[PDB]
Motif scaffolding. Sequence first.
Motif, PDB file in Angstrom:
ATOM      1  N   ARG C  96      39.061 -12.748  28.248  1.00 19.04           N
ATOM      2  CA  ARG C  96      39.385 -14.155  28.437  1.00 19.04           C
ATOM      3  C   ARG C  96      40.276 -14.361  29.646  1.00 19.04           C
ATOM      4  O   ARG C  96      40.077 -15.308  30.416  1.00 19.04           O
ATOM      5  CB  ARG C  96      40.062 -14.730  27.203  1.00 19.04           C
ATOM      6  CG  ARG C  96      40.200 -16.236  27.296  1.00 19.04           C
ATOM      7  CD  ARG C  96      40.576 -16.784  25.977  1.00 19.04           C
ATOM      8  NE  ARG C  96      40.955 -18.188  25.960  1.00 19.04           N
ATOM      9  CZ  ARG C  96      42.203 -18.629  26.013  1.00 19.04           C
ATOM     10  NH1 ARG C  96      43.228 -17.798  26.113  1.00 19.04           N
ATOM     11  NH2 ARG C  96      42.429 -19.937  25.959  1.00 19.04           N
ATOM     12  N   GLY C  99      38.221 -13.811  32.850  1.00 12.90           N
ATOM     13  CA  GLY C  99      37.228 -14.810  33.171  1.00 12.90           C
ATOM     14  C   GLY C  99      35.799 -14.423  32.864  1.00 12.90           C
ATOM     15  O   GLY C  99      34.910 -15.274  32.992  1.00 12.90           O
ATOM     16  N   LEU C 101      34.756 -13.760  29.924  1.00 16.18           N
ATOM     17  CA  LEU C 101      34.545 -14.467  28.674  1.00 16.18           C
ATOM     18  C   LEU C 101      34.852 -15.944  28.876  1.00 16.18           C
ATOM     19  O   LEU C 101      35.891 -16.287  29.451  1.00 16.18           O
ATOM     20  CB  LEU C 101      35.482 -13.893  27.624  1.00 16.18           C
ATOM     21  CG  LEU C 101      35.391 -14.205  26.153  1.00 16.18           C
ATOM     22  CD1 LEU C 101      35.738 -12.998  25.436  1.00 16.18           C
ATOM     23  CD2 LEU C 101      36.472 -15.168  25.916  1.00 16.18           C
ATOM     24  N   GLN C 102      34.056 -16.821  28.259  1.00 16.61           N
ATOM     25  CA  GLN C 102      34.284 -18.277  28.460  1.00 16.61           C
ATOM     26  C   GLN C 102      34.469 -18.982  27.113  1.00 16.61           C
ATOM     27  O   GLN C 102      33.548 -19.705  26.690  1.00 16.61           O
ATOM     28  CB  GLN C 102      33.111 -18.884  29.233  1.00 16.61           C
ATOM     29  CG  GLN C 102      32.938 -18.304  30.628  1.00 16.61           C
ATOM     30  CD  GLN C 102      31.689 -18.807  31.311  1.00 16.61           C
ATOM     31  OE1 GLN C 102      30.830 -19.431  30.693  1.00 16.61           O
ATOM     32  NE2 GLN C 102      31.579 -18.532  32.600  1.00 16.61           N
ATOM     33  N   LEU C 103      35.635 -18.782  26.486  1.00 16.22           N
ATOM     34  CA  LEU C 103      35.980 -19.455  25.204  1.00 16.22           C
ATOM     35  C   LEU C 103      37.218 -20.327  25.444  1.00 16.22           C
ATOM     36  O   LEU C 103      38.260 -19.772  25.839  1.00 16.22           O
ATOM     37  CB  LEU C 103      36.257 -18.393  24.136  1.00 16.22           C
ATOM     38  CG  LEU C 103      35.120 -17.407  23.867  1.00 16.22           C
ATOM     39  CD1 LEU C 103      33.799 -18.138  23.682  1.00 16.22           C
ATOM     40  CD2 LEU C 103      35.010 -16.384  24.986  1.00 16.22           C
ATOM     41  N   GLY C 106      42.187 -20.630  22.216  1.00 13.31           N
ATOM     42  CA  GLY C 106      43.116 -19.546  22.469  1.00 13.31           C
ATOM     43  C   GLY C 106      43.500 -18.748  21.243  1.00 13.31           C
ATOM     44  O   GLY C 106      44.176 -17.725  21.366  1.00 13.31           O
TER      45      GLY C 106
END
Lengths: 331, 329, 219, 207, 241
Positions: C96, C99, C101-103, C106
């Motif tokens: 995360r 970058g 990963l795109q979630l 948090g």
Amino acid sequence: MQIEVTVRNITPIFSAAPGSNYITIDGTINPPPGVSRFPLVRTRMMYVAADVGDGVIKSVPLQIVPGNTMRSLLRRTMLKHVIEPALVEKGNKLSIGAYATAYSGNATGNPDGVPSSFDEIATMRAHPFIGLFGGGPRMLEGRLMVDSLYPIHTNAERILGAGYENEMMSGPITQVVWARRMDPILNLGSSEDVEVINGGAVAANGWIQDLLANSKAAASKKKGRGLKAFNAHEVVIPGLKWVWRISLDRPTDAQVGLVLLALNKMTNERIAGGHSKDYGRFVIDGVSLNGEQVWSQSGITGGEQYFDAVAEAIDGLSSKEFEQFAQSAKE
Amino acid sequence: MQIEVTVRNITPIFSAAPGSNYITIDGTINPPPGVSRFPLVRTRMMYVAADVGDGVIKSVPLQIVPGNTMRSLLRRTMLKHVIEPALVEKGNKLSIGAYATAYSGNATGNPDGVPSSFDEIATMRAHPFIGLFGGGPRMLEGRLMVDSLYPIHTNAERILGAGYENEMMSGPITQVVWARRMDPILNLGSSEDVEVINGGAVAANGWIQDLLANSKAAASKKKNGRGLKAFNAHEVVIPGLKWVWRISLDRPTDAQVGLVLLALNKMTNERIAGGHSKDYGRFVIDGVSLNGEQVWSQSGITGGEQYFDAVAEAIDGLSSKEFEQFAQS
Amino acid sequence: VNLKVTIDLSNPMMEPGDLLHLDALLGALRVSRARAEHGDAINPRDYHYDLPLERYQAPSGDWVFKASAFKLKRQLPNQMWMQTGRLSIVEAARHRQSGYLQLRAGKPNPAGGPFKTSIYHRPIVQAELTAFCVGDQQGIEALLSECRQIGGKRGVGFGQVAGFKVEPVAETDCPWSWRALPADADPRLVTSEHARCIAAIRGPYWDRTLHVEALAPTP
Amino acid sequence: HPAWTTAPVLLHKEFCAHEPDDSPEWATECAQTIQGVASTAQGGTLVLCTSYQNTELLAGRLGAALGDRLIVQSKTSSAATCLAQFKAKHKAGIRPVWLGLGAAWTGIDLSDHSLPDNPELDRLLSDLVITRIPVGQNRSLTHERRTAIGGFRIISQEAAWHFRQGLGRLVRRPGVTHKNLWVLDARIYGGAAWVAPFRQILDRYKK
Amino acid sequence: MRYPSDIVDQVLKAGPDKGLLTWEGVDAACSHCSRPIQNGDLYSPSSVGAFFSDTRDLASTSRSICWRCVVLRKKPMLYGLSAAVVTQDGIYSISKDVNKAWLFTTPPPAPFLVVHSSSTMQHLSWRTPVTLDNRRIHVRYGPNLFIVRPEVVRKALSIADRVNEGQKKWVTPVYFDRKAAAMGHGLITRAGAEMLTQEEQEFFQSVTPGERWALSYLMHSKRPEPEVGECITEKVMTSLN
DNA sequence: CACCCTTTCATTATTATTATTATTATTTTTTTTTTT
Ligand SMILES: [Zn+2]
């Protein structure tokens, strides 16, 4: 960084093994009952698959220091010599829960299973110390991974692949060391010796009569505990060569620099136990960084990028990360 | 496509088992109540039917790592070592369900049954990674099969029926490793040790009196806030033992075998069964037999160059859009 | 030819929650044989009835294969297998911040979602499995020779077949009827062990769309 | 390790049941087995003994039995002299038997150079016999120090090395045929564990 | 009584939510009900949030929830039906040990539906089959399907009584876990190893895992007599409406 | 809008354990090579 460090213990190693072990006066471990037996506190043993003979592969006992132990030792050296000095030369200070988190992993028991934020996990694993020891109440995965201390021994041949066939021991590797614990007022001999005791001779003789009455009580029980306790404990012999494998899954250079600065403070530290008997003193005779030998007698003389990274990360060290690490979500 | 990976655990193996296992101060396991007994999580163990000592089979203990842990370890070694660098260089990023399908294989992208067309099913099984670990919402069949890590032992001797009687372990396989956490506010004691505390001496002494009151409360309770002192045990598999590992690919593509081989190449920096702090699961690969012919070298896999070339073209061809089409639609 | 299959397996298998028909097994072996032959992109419903097994027809349609469910002769005590699905929260945090990963969220959630740690216990048996069927021999031999494992969740390595033997037996010696068949099925074949349930009688025995009233035994 | 190094090799189950302890009874029994091998030999035979005493005992049990055919290597007979002697007897058409040790274990070319292009008719060594597992055959200072460090693992390791070097005398080139290998040490066929490595090289041959 | 979703309109009388679409085209099964949605029936598109972990036990890949399932996926339905017994007349709670004893020994005669929660609540109402015959019972426990035979259960009760006739202390023959999560769940006790016959030991292994989980409920020291549940149908209706 | 977050329900009720068992001790005698 796959750090491999060989430390020569120059005094015995006594990481005590929990249990109820006994020994006779001769030196036979755990005798059959009925013979006069004395309590023995053995050193830490692991069973290891090893080459006895040729292909007869067997579980032999090899005497080690636990990975949890030397891991705690690695934490305490860095915490004592790098973290808290650099935390108190500035005005930063730690709460008692955050000291407990920095030392014991957790501020208390009963952890909250509520997990922690992704920005938080990333910032703690980018921390020099917290990413190594990922404790906290929300349980991090620390990136420092510490091996048990192995003696460079013929029973550890399968553990240590190659390069350690020389300087490698064999055979029995321990010694039983006995302790007496002599009652002190039996050593008392004159009125000059007895003047510091309140009452002098009367109190000394009264404790003597107490000891003889307890002796009659012991003789009645055989056919309130005194100060004569003669026992044994098994140590690993001194001068042995040991190997220690620190592992870091994708470390920041500051983090392996913290390991290396801790290793710098590794000298004048005690490995296992027996603090009254000076057990566990040692000298590092090798450090390898990705297999590259980075230990001279003066110090490291290498790993310079990790050293300046941990330098920059310890003037950047403060107590905010520690406090938000120790903060419990339920509390 | 059968791969037999024989490994040697440099450090011990501890694959934690369910249950509130109990142990005395000695090595007696799960004692009768009324004695001083301690918490204990042993390693994973199963009863296997072994033809040991005589013509009949008996349920003997055999402590291993589960194949789910191993499939996940293989999946993560491909992800971090092959999928991460090749995908990262291109510049592609993964969504919610794309990462959930790649890393967990779970259906959280859309938690309903995805109707998958046959063309999509054929090309994602023909895709290397999605072929190996299909799953999630598309519910895809995995080309890759992972057997659990069996040690070369008398108890597993019939699982390893031929060609494993040499270098074969006998007797006890596990050992209780004890761990004590203790209070470090018990391990203080200098004025220089305490100036780093918020509140300092009084704060440490308040911790002390809290621990004292908790101890008296517990002692009166025997005849819920606990402290930091914790003495416990965990049973671990002994180190140095050779484990076998069967990796069966049900009619694979060549890039799939190349991906498994690159994972077996780069697997040396990753660990088995957890126990990360104790640094358990450290291991070294002794051999890799690809359909029975030995192909593992000390410096990786020597041979199988068609597998390496196919996976090289595949990871040059690796894109996150295939992961997204496996995830969302 | 009226033959019994027994199968002895090396690793223990997962104890089947509902009775598993042998016909279902050999239908999968025919499907995988077709996948070897006619490639990956094939409809499995065309080959999963193409079996070396004879067909019993109920009085109102409702044909089933002449097979039976596998009966277990336990060599070992039963156990329970735990497995967990947990997404690596630490790896996801690194991905995360990197970058890849795109979630947007948090915080993970072990109760549900992507990062749901989940623990499930499935029953485990190591046994000898016996099934009765009416059918020719050599097709069953070739199919079960292609067969590597038995039981569910095979991707984690369970229930690999050590060996199998398939042999003829007498006409009255094999109740192949120990099997899920349409209730309208003839009484001779329904015993006291069979009972009415929402059971599958054919093909995919997990397809709940095709499930209908049926007389089935219990495993 | 190609297949053709072990494919022409012929492995016999027959052996000497008496273990070699430098005793007379072993030497008579081993001499009987060596006479059997020499009778079934259609060419040259090399038996490989470990010790001078074993060789002297075999020579006293086989000299009158085998007549001119016997060749002994000793203090006064080098390995090269008996090499040229073995080649001379195979040149003369009679089938020699050799009681070889020392350099006869390691580093001797027993392939015919009078038959360069045709290895199918190569017949210098039809029968190779191992009378005893070559334990303790190196006593150099460095190897004795290495034995003192490692233990019996070094000795069993080097014994396996000497065993494979003694077994390498049979096949020297592809294309040969009907090569006979015999091992007569009784520890080969006992259940002892320390002789376990000498099984698996033995396991690379069949029937 | 044919589908689990029949516990919406035959018992617990509820209507459609009316924000649901009517089905068009060639009929497909519901993802959760296992019921075919036919033309003119009310459906919702599958609007499951990402927390939904029962995607594994979905009947079909239609992404179409039948309206009965939409009621079954309501939370009052999820916690209300977590520990209850379903019959054609009404719902009985299976929470009490005696309620469980009444379910696996002399069950009610109607085609009921048995649902029991391994956690706080999950989605198990739409994934278990209905039990047309009393002898074979489909129990939903957590995410795992179960089969109990009442005749097998009573037989195991009679043996647990029979080896425990005449001794003061109740000792169980075989340990079973109520959560069915222990490795020893199913393993015969040492006391049961000596008080258990070779045929009895092989019978007790021969029972299906549902009966193991069942007999955990009624195999404890104070043996529960079969007692009928108190009514929960009116409570569930009140909580739904 | 998609996503991301906070809080409701149930009341179960004893709880057998794998009684398996755990730390060693065996050989043996060559005679090469082709360097200062
Ligand atoms: Zn529906």
